[PDB]
Amino acid sequence: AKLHDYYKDEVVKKLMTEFNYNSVMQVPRVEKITLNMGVGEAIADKKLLDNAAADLAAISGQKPLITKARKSVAGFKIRQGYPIGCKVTLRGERMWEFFERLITIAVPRIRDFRGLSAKSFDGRGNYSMGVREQIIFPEIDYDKVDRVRGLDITITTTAKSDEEGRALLAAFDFPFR
Amino acid sequence: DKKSARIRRATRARRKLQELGATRLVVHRTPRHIYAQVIAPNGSEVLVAASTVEKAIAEQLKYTGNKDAAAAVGKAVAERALEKGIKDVSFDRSGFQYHGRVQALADAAREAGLQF
Amino acid sequence: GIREKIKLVSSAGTGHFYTTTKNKRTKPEKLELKKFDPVVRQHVIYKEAK
Amino acid sequence: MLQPKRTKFRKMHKGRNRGLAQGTDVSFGSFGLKAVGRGRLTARQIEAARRAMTRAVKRQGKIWIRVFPDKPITEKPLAVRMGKGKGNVEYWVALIQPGKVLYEMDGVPEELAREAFKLAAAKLPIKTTFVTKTVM
Amino acid sequence: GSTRNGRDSEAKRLGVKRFGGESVLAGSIIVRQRGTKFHAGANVGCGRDHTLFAKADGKVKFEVKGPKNRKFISIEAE
Amino acid sequence: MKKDIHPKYEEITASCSCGNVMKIRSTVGHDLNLDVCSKCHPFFTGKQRDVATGGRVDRFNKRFNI
RNA sequence: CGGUGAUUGGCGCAGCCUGGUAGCGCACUUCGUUCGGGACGAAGGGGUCGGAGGUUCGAAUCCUCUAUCACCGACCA
RNA sequence: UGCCUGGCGGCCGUAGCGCGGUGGUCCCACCUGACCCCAUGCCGAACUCAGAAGUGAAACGCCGUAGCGCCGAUGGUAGUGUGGGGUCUCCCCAUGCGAGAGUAGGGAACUGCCAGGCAA
RNA sequence: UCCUCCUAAAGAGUAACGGAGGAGCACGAAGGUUGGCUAAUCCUGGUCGGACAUCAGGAGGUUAGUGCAAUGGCAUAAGCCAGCUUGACUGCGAGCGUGACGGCGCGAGCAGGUGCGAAAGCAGGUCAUAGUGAUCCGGUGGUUCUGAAUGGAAGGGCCAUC
RNA sequence: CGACUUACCAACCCGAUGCAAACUGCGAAUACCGGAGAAUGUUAUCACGGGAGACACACGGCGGGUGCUAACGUCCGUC
RNA sequence: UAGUCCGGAUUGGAGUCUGCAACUCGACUCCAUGAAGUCGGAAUCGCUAGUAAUCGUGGAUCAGAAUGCCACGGUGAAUAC
């Protein structure tokens, strides 16, 4: 958590002059980082989900939870209560360490990288990015994996507008294509 | 919501408990100044009310809102409940899990002589 | 039709038994229920039989 | 023929036609065709009284149809005895109370609307009258 | 031709048996009903068929309580 | 956090070709050798070679020689 | 007038019973043999189950209404 | 005795939504750290523990605002018990009851017990 | 034969070859207790991924769910999840409802023995209403109740049951 | 691989308008249950015992299903 | 022993020659790219001696433009009961 203490008196102090806040609790704070992995093809192989659950054990810092199907559709042959994905909702102490490792030594590992999209906001201030490889994280030994499908990082903040949550990530230099 | 989710949580232990006409012990756990009171079965009046917000309790305690402060409330309730001739009560969790300060307030009442 | 009937015979000294039904072709395991025995006035574990 | 689309039930009861009407005030147009007698209008009678009325007010203008049948009527076939089930649905009637405005019209003079509602009133089994949109 | 209906059932004889202020001996069925149309109140029990049976030889009295206004059935004690 | 179900959280020391030694908490193992970091990456110089790429008049005058 | 049972490739049949796939004999397209056709070998293409409207996560399959395609009837005065 | 606040009730939209303003010495909430009591079908987000640096931001309480929701007259109309009548698939008369919808209007809740702060 | 709505005329009941649908099952968890939680359908963003799989946020409010066709009911949730268990127990049962009757249905409370919960308390099945047939005769086990002179036994009777 | 003109059909809310036995954010009059009271009625009320008959109904008003809001038609509830 | 340092199509950029001029519509070079293809169904072709098979060179045509045609050599079989 190097950039956790950097948040306390170089990011909150910066945001008090960009949107003229009157209280110290009016600053947008980040709440959680959720790592979905939409495997999808677990109807054919059950161990494909177990290899997908092993990738989040190295990319994140803890064990994933498999996600059952909410509804049931026939266009993809899934039933009610079938594991079709896996998620890691990391927050608290280990999220400042994961956000440190992501934007510094994992975003420049993206093949054919130009910059992150600055319009990927949900109208509230919650950013969501999507990567297409596992090899952007150094924890994978490149020989145990057999699937191109990566994951998607969702950063949930406590902002209200898209511009208000844009200035929160802008302190971490967050390359902004 | 945090407040209204606890009101519906305790309503099973409120509507059933007042159907029997039992003099209930309602606790209210708070991170500072935990409360507890004895309520008559009509629901509109109380009999015994004591907590750490009074100056007769918090002067003998270092911090109000931990386990040994909750033990001082449940002892002070049972010493005043026996003065009114009230022996048999029924404990009400009021939407709090019976693990920590709401257990030590209930353990200290069963040590002093409040039979429930 | 599918759910046939069985007989839970007491393992105690008496011959009192409860009757019930159990689907054999889906859950073929025997029952090990623990009901009250009115002869011994005990709570003896019952076992499945025919 | 004004016919409903996917009703909840195929066949309903006969029902009485007691009471008064609700559509009394002329709302959409300026001149209305208000009913006086108590009867009912089958689905062919609205469409037949529309052809003899729209042609007299030559197609410029606008005509509102304030009634819709949504009520099935059964009919037993010939040489069929009583009972043995309910008859088959043949046509659709609109229960007309006294005071119900049938048609409305706007965009025509008062003389053209007078000599056109009379052409539609001769197609209907009920006695109608000529009404005008009043203020308030 | 033929018909496909003509089937119904033994009317269940539901509704309220004992009305308003009308002394009922404990255990007396008051309301026999499908669901909890009428809810059990003071001194009145609810069965496994939502039959609110009396529990104290007294009167009856229906009410409306809470914030849902559910006729409620209590028992004045005389 | 729970026990016996989560992977190891041993602190390692990463290093890139720019000499930017930065310690992180991860699950790689013994050590980590990296290529680039958030600094010394062609993201602010990568767009420099993209704006002045297009153009055909200046391509023509190199074959005109005067 | 009803009642019983089907309407699936250009032809007509299995598949429905017991819901998760549309298949067979022909024909047609191309190549091969023959001077050339016919025949014969090889590769391949073509319907998405009459229509609507239920049931379920899902319908050719399960139910109801329809259209004309066959068979069975239609009493005794 | 007043203003506040917290817990427990009656009543349940005249009581609920929206907008604007305001509250922190009390109280309350956010928050702080979690090795430990406990616990996440992963995460201490929830629950639980030990404390009080900061804020009233989110939540909650209070006030104003009718922009909605809601209450609701008086009169009229429909309907109908009893006794008669008619151009009797419907309607009227005598008498008794009397809607629903709509209008004027009211309307930003009232109050009981106990504890704490403050002014008296 | 049974269950749900309407006809059925605001207590109950009420017919027709009247109008619409279902049942002759299932479950040892889909039951009991304790603890916690609130969806459907849309909108935006995001790797394969698209109208619809999984993740984040907003509106919305029970239009969702309740094993099963319908009605009534459900936020204290009867809906969902997890831990422990078998009260889906025996002998009763004041008091009513509904039937001409055979019958059917609810049931406070007592004794014994347990299950859950710290405790107050709940549990003698499933949110309720269909999932079913009387007797005779015969079979299985227990109980010396009787047992044709006496002592047994066979056969009868009672209980559980096919 | 991208799209310019757009006589036309048209989902949800918004304003207005009707309909429904299987729709009810509303809601009567009658009818039914229980309690108090004056008057009247040969106890007209209930239970038990002896004896039956009857269980083919018809019409008129009112609320209806059905038939064609046809029948001295048929099936219901009350008088 | 892998579609792999096999194979070279397709395609982008930069050029050389020829010709009055190379977009339709030439040949060649440099860099980059990497496809189908893993011995081929019915059926069918050529060959018994320097023959088949494999490799390169030269000429005509021609300003430039061949895998085609015409010729020249290097290695060099098997079988014909």
UniProtKB/Swiss-Prot annotation, chain A:
Residues bearing PTM N6-acetyllysine: K2
Self-association state and partner proteins as the record states: Part of the 50S ribosomal subunit; part of the 5S rRNA/L5/L18/L25 subcomplex. Contacts the 5S rRNA; cross-links to the P site tRNA. Forms a bridge to the 30S subunit in the 70S ribosome, contacting protein S13 and S19.
Name this polypeptide is given: Large ribosomal subunit protein uL5
Miscellaneous: Identified as a multicopy suppressor of the slow growth phenotype of an rsgA (yjeQ) deletion mutant.
InterPro entries: Ribosomal_uL5, Ribosomal_uL5_bac-type, Ribosomal_uL5_C, Ribosomal_uL5_CS, Ribosomal_uL5_dom_sf, Ribosomal_uL5_N
Gene that this polypeptide is encoded by: rplE
Family from the record: Belongs to the universal ribosomal protein uL5 family.
GO biological process: cytoplasmic translation; ribosomal large subunit assembly; translation
Gene Ontology CC annotations of this record: cytoplasm; cytosol; cytosolic large ribosomal subunit
UniProtKB/Swiss-Prot annotation, chain D:
One GO process term, biological-process aspect: cytoplasmic translation
GO terms for cellular component: cytoplasm; cytosolic large ribosomal subunit
N-methylmethionine PTM positions: M1
Post-translational modification: Is hydroxylated on Arg-81 by RoxA. The modification is nearly suppressed when E.coli is grown in anoxia.
Record flagged with keyword RNA-binding: yes
UniProt xrefs under InterPro entries: Ribosomal_uL16, Ribosomal_uL16_bact-type, Ribosomal_uL16_CS, Ribosomal_uL16_dom, Ribosomal_uL16_sf
A GO molecular function held by the record: rRNA binding
Its job: Binds directly to 23S ribosomal RNA and is located at the A site of the peptidyltransferase center. It contacts the A and P site tRNAs. One of the last ribosomal proteins to be assembled in the 50S subunit. The simultaneous presence of uL16 and bL36 probably triggers ObgE's GTPase activity and eventual dissociation from the mature 50S ribosmal subunit. It has an essential role in subunit assembly.
Family the UniProt entry places it in: Belongs to the universal ribosomal protein uL16 family.
Subunit record text: Part of the 50S ribosomal subunit. Cross-links to the A and P site tRNAs. Interacts with assembly factor DarP(YjgA).
Name of the protein in question: Large ribosomal subunit protein uL16
Organism the protein comes from: Escherichia coli (strain K12)
Originating gene: rplP
Swiss-Prot record, chain E:
Keywords: Ribonucleoprotein, Ribosomal protein, RNA-binding, rRNA-binding, tRNA-binding
Renumbered residue ranges of the record's region Disordered: 1-13
Gene Ontology cellular-component terms listed: cytoplasm; cytosolic large ribosomal subunit
UniProt GO BP: assembly of large subunit precursor of preribosome; cytoplasmic translation; cytosolic ribosome assembly; positive regulation of ribosome biogenesis; regulation of cell growth; ribosomal large subunit assembly
One GO molecular-function entry: tRNA binding
The keyword Hydrolase is assigned to this record: no
HAMAP family: Ribosomal_bL27
Family: Belongs to the bacterial ribosomal protein bL27 family.
Subunit and interaction comment: Part of the 50S ribosomal subunit. Cross-links to the 23S rRNA. Cross-links to the A and P site tRNAs.
Name of this chain's protein: Large ribosomal subunit protein bL27
Species, as recorded: Escherichia coli (strain K12)
UniProtKB/Swiss-Prot annotation, chain F:
UniProt modification remark: Proteolytically cleaved by protease VII to yield a peptide lacking residues 63-70. It is not clear if this is due to protein degradation or is a bona fide processing event in the strain used in PubMed:339950 and PubMed:10556732. In strains B, D10, MRE-600 and Q13 the only protein seen in PubMed:10556732 was full-length; the last 7 amino acids were sequenced only for strain MRE-600.
Protein name: Large ribosomal subunit protein bL31
Keyword match Oxidoreductase: no
UniProt entry keywords in alphabetical sequence: Acetylation, Metal-binding, Ribonucleoprotein, Ribosomal protein, RNA-binding, rRNA-binding, Zinc
Organism: Escherichia coli (strain K12)
Cofactor: how and how many bound: Binds 1 zinc ion per subunit. Only 1 ligand appears to be Cys, the other are thought to be His and either backbone amides or solvent.
Effect of C18S: Binds Zn(2+) normally
Molecular-function GO term, any one: zinc ion binding
Subunit details: Part of the 50S ribosomal subunit.
